[PDB]
């Protein structure tokens, strides 16, 4: 199924690409050479293109060899949109600027080659009443031009789709604009606005080598993963660690001045286990002092139970008792096996539970646990 | 009043009015120009012959821009324009029309194709005759001006070994033929396309926003890192030292208080910590039981002048000249005499050539008697 191209069907010629150049072979019957020149006029358009004409008793072979750097139309499809619209602007201009009277155009893709400057060139030209296209056909050339421009810019369909079946196929917005042009200046203005819009868009863009762009991105992301711990630590050091140091300085100053109530208020927002053992000692002796027990009872606690060399559990007991945390202090008293710590905290816990209503079944169960231990220790301490 | 290159070569005044590009010559230098209308028929061309002037007016289509508008385009467009400029000169075949490849004579369309405004006429309008060598040098200078743009047209055209040209400008100006020059431009176009493949394209607004975000992160990270370094390596070890010396003070371990706060200056420590450090220096001094009792409950107390703490820390650290000044400030004669005596002992056991020590020893002995 050797299906022929548009150029081949229109001229009734075989178009091929050999090492010698582009071949356009016609039948002698369809070529009228009435002068002596043998279609010598075709060499007057692109003198830089090597042009040969072979006339035999039954065939006419035209050979066009453009410079090696010139590429066939098919190589436009892979270029960028800016280049496509520049090629289409220059393709319309080359058709519009054609003035050679004896030479007739055929705007087909198989007939176009372009240079490094994206300028299009036609390989085969018809000769007036000699080589097809025999006569000028402005309407045929106009429709060929809009289909070639649409094929080069859109590229969604083949040249014959844009050219012949135009009122049947759902074309692109860019291709419909090209194919619906009513004049050369209208199409040139349509193409110019697309070039102008692309050039304007490109001006608002920066072009960075991917390696440089990527290293700047990892630098920026590295700054973020370094700023989140530095900010979080700074917040802790400024709003938690620094005011704790000043509180430890202030509570240690108030302790030396026997201002036991001031030590309590200065360290009131801190948990006993967060404070150092020496600070725990000072807070516990301050709670013991503020408790206002007997002179002899206080003397027993301060030099036998809550000393700088005693179990830090003794400090935790008096801080819990001093902060109204009796259920917590009772557990500490049970751990140290000190029955006086258990009984003295159980008595205060009973009053704390008694302040709560007698309609909370959890409070009544806890109050029944306390009352049983207080009546057990009273009969034991009074006998032995 | 030096004119432009085009003006000096043709002996004409070149201007741009609303009617088009003006090229006015003197009647005497114009020899009897309808051939001028055969190159760009799309350009409106008029010739006015006055009794002493010939004014040529070329009006290309509105969309065509002057040579000066290439400078703001991208390098790829500048190379493509140069390619088509070399081709326009190479393809010029009209025998009676002569070229002048000057920037003030070139315009270009949306497809970057260059066009010449004024053409000379054979033995009629300058350039009167063809000059292939002048045209070749004009072309390479115009191509170099359009592509490089670092210097003016006359600098590239000068063709002298005086100006240190760019590598691209030198390549264009050193071309030996039209094909050598076209191929030279082609490899530069091909090398630009290959370089473009390794590039990412970010909208300038997006790239600028993240640059200020990134710079804002740096101005926020330097104070956060510096504060974190201070809090971790200076503020935290000082808090632990204050905790440790306050624990040792409560345990009557006066020598331990001294060694815990030894790396800190007395004025950097809080007043309560200064008190504990001073009473520790007083205790370590090992004075009399009664003498120590007088100091601890009359001079170095939690409610006394912090200068008393500074005196005992200076005395305890061998800073006798500093302690003497503090004793003089508090007007306490016992603080002056007791520090002057230890300063005399420090000066003793050094050398028998210290006249400054003998003068200081004579000052202390007179006040004690």
mmCIF file of C-alpha atoms in Angstrom, chain B residues 135-346:
data_model
loop_
_atom_site.group_PDB
_atom_site.id
_atom_site.type_symbol
_atom_site.label_atom_id
_atom_site.label_comp_id
_atom_site.label_asym_id
_atom_site.label_seq_id
_atom_site.Cartn_x
_atom_site.Cartn_y
_atom_site.Cartn_z
ATOM 1 C CA UNK B 135 30.351 45.333 3.378
ATOM 2 C CA UNK B 136 32.101 42.217 4.801
ATOM 3 C CA UNK B 137 33.546 44.254 7.688
ATOM 4 C CA UNK B 138 30.236 46.099 8.261
ATOM 5 C CA UNK B 139 28.389 42.752 8.460
ATOM 6 C CA UNK B 140 30.772 41.183 11.024
ATOM 7 C CA UNK B 141 30.614 44.344 13.159
ATOM 8 C CA UNK B 142 26.785 44.437 13.002
ATOM 9 C CA UNK B 143 26.601 40.721 13.904
ATOM 10 C CA UNK B 144 29.039 41.239 16.796
ATOM 11 C CA UNK B 145 27.122 44.323 18.011
ATOM 12 C CA UNK B 146 23.803 42.400 17.932
ATOM 13 C CA UNK B 147 25.206 39.289 19.659
ATOM 14 C CA UNK B 148 27.875 40.633 22.120
ATOM 15 C CA UNK B 149 26.715 44.256 22.634
ATOM 16 C CA UNK B 150 29.609 45.085 25.003
ATOM 17 C CA UNK B 151 30.924 47.839 22.669
ATOM 18 C CA UNK B 152 29.613 50.214 19.913
ATOM 19 C CA UNK B 153 29.458 49.361 16.143
ATOM 20 C CA UNK B 154 32.564 51.507 15.381
ATOM 21 C CA UNK B 155 34.606 49.531 17.971
ATOM 22 C CA UNK B 156 33.952 46.173 16.254
ATOM 23 C CA UNK B 157 34.316 47.709 12.771
ATOM 24 C CA UNK B 158 37.677 49.391 13.743
ATOM 25 C CA UNK B 159 39.314 45.974 12.989
ATOM 26 C CA UNK B 160 42.408 46.927 15.011
ATOM 27 C CA UNK B 161 44.513 44.928 17.518
ATOM 28 C CA UNK B 162 43.746 47.464 20.256
ATOM 29 C CA UNK B 163 40.508 46.371 21.971
ATOM 30 C CA UNK B 164 40.324 43.222 24.126
ATOM 31 C CA UNK B 165 37.176 41.710 22.545
ATOM 32 C CA UNK B 166 34.906 38.931 23.921
ATOM 33 C CA UNK B 167 35.403 35.286 22.815
ATOM 34 C CA UNK B 168 32.090 35.373 20.915
ATOM 35 C CA UNK B 169 32.787 38.823 19.390
ATOM 36 C CA UNK B 170 36.266 37.704 18.273
ATOM 37 C CA UNK B 171 34.824 34.559 16.641
ATOM 38 C CA UNK B 172 32.361 36.635 14.572
ATOM 39 C CA UNK B 173 34.930 39.309 13.619
ATOM 40 C CA UNK B 174 37.585 36.678 12.713
ATOM 41 C CA UNK B 175 35.343 34.849 10.161
ATOM 42 C CA UNK B 176 37.168 34.404 6.826
ATOM 43 C CA UNK B 177 34.089 33.644 4.646
ATOM 44 C CA UNK B 178 30.248 33.729 4.603
ATOM 45 C CA UNK B 179 29.971 29.932 5.055
ATOM 46 C CA UNK B 180 32.554 30.026 7.900
ATOM 47 C CA UNK B 181 30.397 32.699 9.610
ATOM 48 C CA UNK B 182 27.023 30.968 9.073
ATOM 49 C CA UNK B 183 28.343 27.673 10.495
ATOM 50 C CA UNK B 184 29.982 29.600 13.376
ATOM 51 C CA UNK B 185 26.532 31.000 14.329
ATOM 52 C CA UNK B 186 24.898 27.529 13.876
ATOM 53 C CA UNK B 187 27.287 25.837 16.396
ATOM 54 C CA UNK B 188 26.554 28.695 18.857
ATOM 55 C CA UNK B 189 22.791 28.107 18.369
ATOM 56 C CA UNK B 190 23.293 24.342 18.857
ATOM 57 C CA UNK B 191 25.414 24.931 21.985
ATOM 58 C CA UNK B 192 22.753 27.266 23.452
ATOM 59 C CA UNK B 193 20.046 24.581 22.891
ATOM 60 C CA UNK B 194 22.181 21.948 24.646
ATOM 61 C CA UNK B 195 22.830 24.294 27.599
ATOM 62 C CA UNK B 196 19.063 25.147 27.776
ATOM 63 C CA UNK B 197 18.348 21.404 28.328
ATOM 64 C CA UNK B 198 20.157 21.509 31.711
ATOM 65 C CA UNK B 199 18.020 24.471 32.918
ATOM 66 C CA UNK B 200 14.802 24.808 34.958
ATOM 67 C CA UNK B 201 12.413 27.731 34.323
ATOM 68 C CA UNK B 202 10.853 29.350 37.413
ATOM 69 C CA UNK B 203 8.554 32.403 37.297
ATOM 70 C CA UNK B 204 10.582 35.399 38.593
ATOM 71 C CA UNK B 205 7.818 36.199 41.143
ATOM 72 C CA UNK B 206 7.921 32.655 42.600
ATOM 73 C CA UNK B 207 11.735 32.614 42.661
ATOM 74 C CA UNK B 208 11.847 36.077 44.324
ATOM 75 C CA UNK B 209 9.299 35.153 47.027
ATOM 76 C CA UNK B 210 11.274 32.044 48.109
ATOM 77 C CA UNK B 211 14.544 34.076 48.048
ATOM 78 C CA UNK B 212 13.149 36.570 50.601
ATOM 79 C CA UNK B 213 11.688 33.589 52.576
ATOM 80 C CA UNK B 214 15.130 31.930 52.528
ATOM 81 C CA UNK B 215 16.898 35.166 53.533
ATOM 82 C CA UNK B 216 14.287 35.658 56.305
ATOM 83 C CA UNK B 217 15.129 32.154 57.583
ATOM 84 C CA UNK B 218 18.848 33.082 57.775
ATOM 85 C CA UNK B 219 18.214 36.353 59.700
ATOM 86 C CA UNK B 220 15.986 34.260 62.083
ATOM 87 C CA UNK B 221 18.478 31.325 62.459
ATOM 88 C CA UNK B 222 21.567 33.404 63.407
ATOM 89 C CA UNK B 223 19.970 34.840 66.650
ATOM 90 C CA UNK B 224 18.312 31.479 67.486
ATOM 91 C CA UNK B 225 21.587 29.562 67.078
ATOM 92 C CA UNK B 226 23.643 32.168 68.990
ATOM 93 C CA UNK B 227 21.083 32.196 71.867
ATOM 94 C CA UNK B 228 20.952 28.381 71.936
ATOM 95 C CA UNK B 229 24.783 28.236 72.128
ATOM 96 C CA UNK B 230 24.716 30.690 75.061
ATOM 97 C CA UNK B 231 21.911 28.808 76.861
ATOM 98 C CA UNK B 232 23.543 25.385 76.387
ATOM 99 C CA UNK B 233 27.246 26.202 76.917
ATOM 100 C CA UNK B 234 27.155 29.269 79.258
ATOM 101 C CA UNK B 235 23.764 29.798 80.992
ATOM 102 C CA UNK B 236 23.022 26.122 81.840
ATOM 103 C CA UNK B 237 26.518 25.318 83.328
ATOM 104 C CA UNK B 238 26.251 28.560 85.372
ATOM 105 C CA UNK B 239 22.841 27.495 86.795
ATOM 106 C CA UNK B 240 24.262 24.084 87.745
ATOM 107 C CA UNK B 241 27.277 25.848 89.352
ATOM 108 C CA UNK B 242 24.899 28.095 91.353
ATOM 109 C CA UNK B 243 22.900 24.969 92.409
ATOM 110 C CA UNK B 244 26.138 23.119 93.369
ATOM 111 C CA UNK B 245 27.719 26.035 95.303
ATOM 112 C CA UNK B 246 24.380 26.743 97.103
ATOM 113 C CA UNK B 247 24.236 23.016 98.088
ATOM 114 C CA UNK B 248 27.872 23.040 99.270
ATOM 115 C CA UNK B 249 27.243 26.260 101.253
ATOM 116 C CA UNK B 250 24.355 24.675 103.184
ATOM 117 C CA UNK B 251 26.659 21.713 104.032
ATOM 118 C CA UNK B 252 29.373 24.097 105.405
ATOM 119 C CA UNK B 253 31.707 22.995 102.543
ATOM 120 C CA UNK B 254 33.192 26.468 102.079
ATOM 121 C CA UNK B 255 36.183 25.246 100.009
ATOM 122 C CA UNK B 256 33.800 23.481 97.554
ATOM 123 C CA UNK B 257 31.788 26.729 97.061
ATOM 124 C CA UNK B 258 35.047 28.476 96.085
ATOM 125 C CA UNK B 259 36.080 25.819 93.534
ATOM 126 C CA UNK B 260 32.558 25.587 92.025
ATOM 127 C CA UNK B 261 32.375 29.365 91.379
ATOM 128 C CA UNK B 262 36.128 29.822 90.647
ATOM 129 C CA UNK B 263 35.648 30.313 86.864
ATOM 130 C CA UNK B 264 33.007 33.078 87.416
ATOM 131 C CA UNK B 265 33.639 36.780 88.072
ATOM 132 C CA UNK B 266 32.192 38.054 91.403
ATOM 133 C CA UNK B 267 30.101 40.775 89.661
ATOM 134 C CA UNK B 268 28.484 38.180 87.325
ATOM 135 C CA UNK B 269 27.110 36.151 90.303
ATOM 136 C CA UNK B 270 23.846 37.260 92.015
ATOM 137 C CA UNK B 271 24.135 39.156 95.357
ATOM 138 C CA UNK B 272 22.926 36.097 97.378
ATOM 139 C CA UNK B 273 25.571 33.924 95.664
ATOM 140 C CA UNK B 274 28.199 36.691 96.300
ATOM 141 C CA UNK B 275 27.291 36.504 100.032
ATOM 142 C CA UNK B 276 27.878 32.724 100.122
ATOM 143 C CA UNK B 277 31.141 33.016 98.193
ATOM 144 C CA UNK B 278 32.424 35.807 100.511
ATOM 145 C CA UNK B 279 31.519 33.930 103.755
ATOM 146 C CA UNK B 280 33.252 30.848 102.229
ATOM 147 C CA UNK B 281 36.434 32.898 101.557
ATOM 148 C CA UNK B 282 36.167 34.294 105.161
ATOM 149 C CA UNK B 283 35.803 30.714 106.534
ATOM 150 C CA UNK B 284 38.698 29.331 104.398
ATOM 151 C CA UNK B 285 40.901 32.295 105.546
ATOM 152 C CA UNK B 286 40.965 30.519 108.965
ATOM 153 C CA UNK B 287 40.931 33.689 111.073
ATOM 154 C CA UNK B 288 40.148 33.582 114.853
ATOM 155 C CA UNK B 289 36.832 32.071 116.043
ATOM 156 C CA UNK B 290 35.857 35.489 117.486
ATOM 157 C CA UNK B 291 37.271 37.431 114.497
ATOM 158 C CA UNK B 292 35.267 35.217 112.060
ATOM 159 C CA UNK B 293 32.094 35.672 114.193
ATOM 160 C CA UNK B 294 32.500 39.473 113.959
ATOM 161 C CA UNK B 295 32.788 39.365 110.149
ATOM 162 C CA UNK B 296 29.928 36.893 109.482
ATOM 163 C CA UNK B 297 27.242 38.690 111.599
ATOM 164 C CA UNK B 298 28.384 42.361 111.358
ATOM 165 C CA UNK B 299 30.102 42.837 107.956
ATOM 166 C CA UNK B 300 29.289 39.971 105.530
ATOM 167 C CA UNK B 301 25.525 39.444 106.055
ATOM 168 C CA UNK B 302 22.632 38.782 103.611
ATOM 169 C CA UNK B 303 21.470 42.399 104.182
ATOM 170 C CA UNK B 304 24.883 44.151 103.956
ATOM 171 C CA UNK B 305 26.428 46.260 101.110
ATOM 172 C CA UNK B 306 27.441 43.950 98.216
ATOM 173 C CA UNK B 307 30.839 45.776 98.318
ATOM 174 C CA UNK B 308 31.641 43.697 101.462
ATOM 175 C CA UNK B 309 31.200 40.514 99.357
ATOM 176 C CA UNK B 310 33.419 41.876 96.574
ATOM 177 C CA UNK B 311 36.136 42.759 99.126
ATOM 178 C CA UNK B 312 36.360 39.197 100.527
ATOM 179 C CA UNK B 313 36.168 37.565 97.074
ATOM 180 C CA UNK B 314 39.014 39.835 95.833
ATOM 181 C CA UNK B 315 41.056 39.211 99.020
ATOM 182 C CA UNK B 316 40.364 35.466 98.771
ATOM 183 C CA UNK B 317 41.475 35.379 95.092
ATOM 184 C CA UNK B 318 44.820 37.190 95.536
ATOM 185 C CA UNK B 319 43.542 40.479 94.102
ATOM 186 C CA UNK B 320 44.883 42.633 96.935
ATOM 187 C CA UNK B 321 45.221 45.912 94.961
ATOM 188 C CA UNK B 322 41.519 45.528 93.977
ATOM 189 C CA UNK B 323 40.454 44.720 97.573
ATOM 190 C CA UNK B 324 42.349 47.765 98.945
ATOM 191 C CA UNK B 325 40.343 50.100 96.633
ATOM 192 C CA UNK B 326 37.067 48.533 97.902
ATOM 193 C CA UNK B 327 38.193 48.991 101.529
ATOM 194 C CA UNK B 328 38.941 52.666 100.798
ATOM 195 C CA UNK B 329 35.455 53.095 99.210
ATOM 196 C CA UNK B 330 33.623 51.672 102.272
ATOM 197 C CA UNK B 331 35.826 53.892 104.596
ATOM 198 C CA UNK B 332 36.582 50.750 106.686
ATOM 199 C CA UNK B 333 40.144 51.173 108.022
ATOM 200 C CA UNK B 334 40.312 47.483 109.077
ATOM 201 C CA UNK B 335 39.592 46.442 105.433
ATOM 202 C CA UNK B 336 42.435 48.700 104.194
ATOM 203 C CA UNK B 337 45.078 47.672 106.798
ATOM 204 C CA UNK B 338 44.307 43.918 106.581
ATOM 205 C CA UNK B 339 44.528 43.938 102.749
ATOM 206 C CA UNK B 340 47.665 46.179 102.742
ATOM 207 C CA UNK B 341 49.419 43.588 104.994
ATOM 208 C CA UNK B 342 48.668 40.651 102.645
ATOM 209 C CA UNK B 343 49.719 42.835 99.638
ATOM 210 C CA UNK B 344 53.088 43.449 101.432
ATOM 211 C CA UNK B 345 53.515 39.650 101.887
ATOM 212 C CA UNK B 346 52.743 39.084 98.158
#
